[PDB]
């Protein structure tokens, strides 16, 4: 008598609702009822205290129930699924924080960058190794965090009247990344104090030198453009500032090492950079 | 009593030999006892009278008994295994013939070109569609042939005293290809009359407009460099010259359409063009 | 299969039947560009001539594969090969074949 | 995009220009949803 067409039809949750129409969406809300290796690459995760799996979900390939694109996607599986090391960011005493957009960091690097450029569609999760070596006499903490759909906001002219939008070097800063001008609101008006509801790991220098967050592919879509859409933003921010006495190593680098996990590329055409 | 170490040990042929040493190689010689689709691409082979499989061997992937490289090779399987169309060559009345070196034609094209550049090792066979449309009032024949390890020779200064070697634009002419300066000796001192012992197909214009030679990977090695080593040379030569009356289409193009078949790339490093 | 007006250049009323077909002619033998159209059925352009495209006017969202049948209407003696390339959405207009 | 893969090759006596009729349709996996008013035909003159 009724189209099974509410928003929770495909979900695993039973709903006792009231309906009077042939559309299930017309119904009531109702109530219910250590060496890591990938590719030709190897990292070390002895001092991280665990590896964070983003939302408890391993980066699987696209489910055939879940995909829409009828073209056979390519899975290069070693040549693109491998640790990619970006250029280092120097953690300083005045380091506000940096972000990296994904897979915008890797659309210009490796066969992953070519597969991102040559294919319209892209799907991968990510093993993100953020490492920061410091001595036992250095101190400071990094919130290494994965903010999905990290839409950058502007200062809006500072006052708030100008409707600015962040430039392409800011929304998609590539493998270099972009600093946080305002890490407290994450350049997005949302507090970094609540950033740990996102997949996060602390680089507390006394405790661990590296953070390994393993991120699944997070989208409303089974695949997307690797060039336009950035599925998430990795945020590496000094919540506790870097401190050391003079004589200790002042150059404290944060190296960002990225494994695309189960990369899947569909819609092959010419190589397009953006 | 004897090392099994002759050159025919791994072969399927039994040899009754005489030996007096512990090496089997020391022994005597003895005596014994229509739409083709790959990737996102489709060709038409209605007028070819068959498809030539090179040496009766389909381009399989590398056998695990046959491989040596311990790194896991990537098989992109759709994004590189697909028909690649080169720029056309105009068959003329004075066309001597052209050649194309493999996979040198495709080291700069597609994800195959990137996988050839990013990987030291390469292995693929080839589905080679050579097509030449001409009317029922045009005439001429092409020997479309696959000469494996097509080493180009020079004119040796013409007289024979100069020890010339062909330049890189001649040994590896890319997707454009190189004409035959002397098609009778195939620019190699070997007769084109005997070129049909190699995998060959005739484009006899009255009979067929296209030639589809399917070439396996032919090497002494399971993999090789796609940049240095060219596994074979495709030769498209007008044995019978193109002829037509004035008024018929003088522009008779030969389009070269190439499918790498079961491409396998190992030894991932930076993208190297040569 | 309804006629796709790939040749949606002649707005002239005497030339509106020229919109239903487009001129393959003898070329210089390169990969010359014959015709170009977006593959969007509901878009303002060549697909509005189709029944698919006009029914796509009545719906917001569409999914599924599209067929475009290209029918050569030259002579039996006319021969030749076309590369009909669907470009996935990221690619711009290809400069070459 | 349509590209000349070889060329339009014609003999004497047959026309040097031909025509392609493109016939576009949808496959059996095609669907539509969110039934809306059409913009592909706007009425301008009032129907008397």
């Amino acid at each position: 008598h009724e189209n099974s067409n509410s928003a929770t039809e495909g979900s695993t949750i039973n709903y006792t609702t009231i309906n009077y129409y042939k559309d299930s969406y017309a119904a009531t809300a109702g109530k219910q009822s250590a060496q890591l290796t990938i590719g030709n690459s190897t990292i070390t995760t002895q001092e991280a205290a665990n590896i964070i799996v983003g939302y408890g979900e391993w980066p699987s390939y696209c489910s055939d129930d879940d995909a829409t694109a009828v073209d056979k996607p390519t899975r290069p599986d070693v040549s693109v699924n491998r640790f990619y090391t970006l250029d280092t960011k120097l953690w300083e005493k005045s380091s506000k924080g940096w972000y990296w957009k994904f897979p915008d960091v890797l659309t210009e690097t490796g066969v992953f960058g070519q597969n991102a450029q040559f294919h319209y569609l892209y799907r991968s999760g990510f093993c993100i190794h953020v490492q920061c070596n410091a001595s036992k006499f250095h101190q400071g903490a990094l919130l290494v965090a994965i903010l999905p759909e990290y839409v950058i906001g502007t200062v809006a002219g500072g006052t708030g009247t100008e409707d600015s939008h962040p430039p392409y070097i800011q929304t998609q800063p590539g493998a270099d990344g972009f600093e946080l001008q305002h890490p407290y609101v994450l350049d997005a008006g949302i507090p970094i104090s609540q950033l740990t509801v996102c997949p996060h790991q602390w680089i507390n220098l006394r405790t661990n030198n590296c953070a390994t967050i393993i991120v699944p592919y997070m989208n409303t879509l089974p695949f997307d453009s690797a060039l336009n859409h950035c599925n998430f933003g990795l945020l590496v921010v000094p919540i506790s500032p870097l401190d050391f006495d003079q004589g200790a190593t002042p150059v404290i680098p944060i190296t960002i090492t990225l494994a695309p996990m189960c990369s899947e590329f569909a819609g092959l055409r010419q190589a397009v950079t953006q | 009593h004897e090392n099994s170490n002759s050159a025919t040990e791994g072969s399927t042929i039994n040899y009754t030999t005489i030996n007096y040493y512990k090496d089997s190689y020391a022994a005597t010689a003895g005596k014994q006892s229509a739409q083709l689709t790959i990737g996102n691409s489709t060709i038409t082979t209605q007028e070819a009278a068959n498809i030539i499989v090179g040496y009766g061997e389909w381009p399989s992937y590398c056998s695990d008994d046959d491989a040596t490289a311990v790194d896991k090779p990537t098989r992109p399987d759709v994004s590189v295994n697909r028909f690649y169309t080169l720029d056309t060559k105009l068959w003329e009345k004075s066309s001597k013939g052209w050649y194309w070196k493999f996979p040198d034609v495709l080291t700069e094209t597609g994800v195959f070109g990137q996988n050839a550049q990013f990987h030291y090792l390469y292995r693929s066979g080839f589905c080679i569609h050579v097509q030449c449309n001409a009317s029922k009032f045009h005439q001429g024949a092409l020997l479309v042939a696959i000469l494996p390890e097509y080493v180009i020779g020079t004119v040796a200064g013409g007289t024979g005293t100069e020890d010339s070697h062909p330049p890189y634009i001649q040994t590896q002419p890319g997707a454009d290809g190189f004409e035959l300066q002397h098609p009778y000796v195939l620019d190699a001192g070997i007769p084109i009359s005997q070129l049909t012992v190699c995998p060959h197909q005739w484009i006899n214009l009255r009979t067929n407009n296209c030639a589809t030679i399917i070439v396996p990977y032919m090497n002494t090695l399971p993999f090789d460099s796609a940049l240095n080593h060219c596994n074979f040379g495709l030769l498209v030569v007008p044995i019978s010259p193109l002829d037509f009356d004035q008024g018929a289409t003088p522009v008779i193009p030969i389009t070269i359409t190439l499918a790498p078949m079961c491409s396998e790339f190992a030894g991932l490093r930076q993208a190297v063009t040569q | 299969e309804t006629i796709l007006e790939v040749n949606n250049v002649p707005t002239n009323a005497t030339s509106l039947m020229e919109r239903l077909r487009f001129p393959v002619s003898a070329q210089a033998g390169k990969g010359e560009l014959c015709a170009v159209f977006r593959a969007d059925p509901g878009r303002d352009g060549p697909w509005q001539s189709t029944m698919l495209g006009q029914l796509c006017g009545y719906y917001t969202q569409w999914s599924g594969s599209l067929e475009v049948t290209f029918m050569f209407t030259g002579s039996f003696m006319a021969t030749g090969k076309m590369l009909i390339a669907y470009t996935p959405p990221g690619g711009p207009l290809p400069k070459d074949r | 995009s349509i590209w000349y893969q070889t060329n339009y090759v014609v003999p004497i006596g047959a026309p040097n220009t031909a025509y392609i009729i493109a016939l576009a349709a949808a496959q059996k996996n095609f669907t539509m949803k969110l039934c809306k008013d059409t913009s592909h035909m706007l009425q301008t003159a009032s129907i008397q």
């Binding site: 055939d64 995909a67 009828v70 073209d71 | 990737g39 996102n40 | 599924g64 | 996996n29 949803k33």
Partner: peptide
């Protein structure tokens, strides 16, 4: 006409309503 008569095709378990 079909789509793996045309390209390489993946299994799409398509629940799109008509």
């Amino acid at each position: 006409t079909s789509d793996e008569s045309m390209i390489e095709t993946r299994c799409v378990l398509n629940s799109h309503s008509t």
